[PDB]
Every structure is written in structure tokens, then in C-alpha cells.
Design a binder for this molecule. Sequence first.
Ligand SMILES: [Ca+2]
Ligand code: NA
Length: 114
Amino acid sequence: SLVVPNLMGNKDKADRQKVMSDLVALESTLDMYRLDNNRYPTTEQGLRALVSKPTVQPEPRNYRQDGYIRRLPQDPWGGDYQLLNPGQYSDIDIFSPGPDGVPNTEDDIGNWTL
Ligand SMILES: [Ca+2]
Ligand code: NA
């Protein structure tokens, strides 16, 4: 006879699920980039490197003319996914900035929680 409140918790789980789905897709795309080019994008090159060839070194040596992804997704709050090379927890840390929209805050939802 006691229903635990879950309105926002349920919203949070749905939002986290979209973020994780985006992160998984990005990781797969980053792996295709690495299979071709033998490294992941640098922090400067970023996730944008998956769309078209970066304009800074290290220049990928086997970059598909079509790139690795058609478009970069945004997170559920309209924010941009972030990339750090080298990662603290993985080869590459990839994360949504979360609700607050600021990279590297407590709000970040990252691939280290996959
Ligand atoms: Ca944040
Ligand atoms: Na393309």
C-alpha cells in the first residue's frame, strides 16, 4: 500500500538510457576510425574527427573519404558530447555534459559508467 515516488527518477533513467545509447554508438564509430587509422582522435581533433578529416596533426593516414558517421548526436539536453584522449578510465573518456550543460561537472554522464 506504499508506492515509492519515482517521477523524476524515471525521467533520469530514460535520459541516461539515451545518453548510453549515444555513447555506445560513438564508441563503435571511434573503433572503426581506429581500425583504419591506428589511433583514436586527439582531444583537439575530437568527436568531430569522425564526421570529416581533422585539420590538425596527427593527420589520420587512412581516413575514409566519407568519414565514419553522418552526424554527431546531441545529448537529451541539447548539449555536445565530449572526448578526452587519453581517458582516465578507458582509452578515451566520452561524455555528455548532463543537465547543467557544462563539461567536467558532477552532472556529466560518461562512458566510464557503462
Ligand atoms: Ca556537466
Ligand atoms: Na560523410
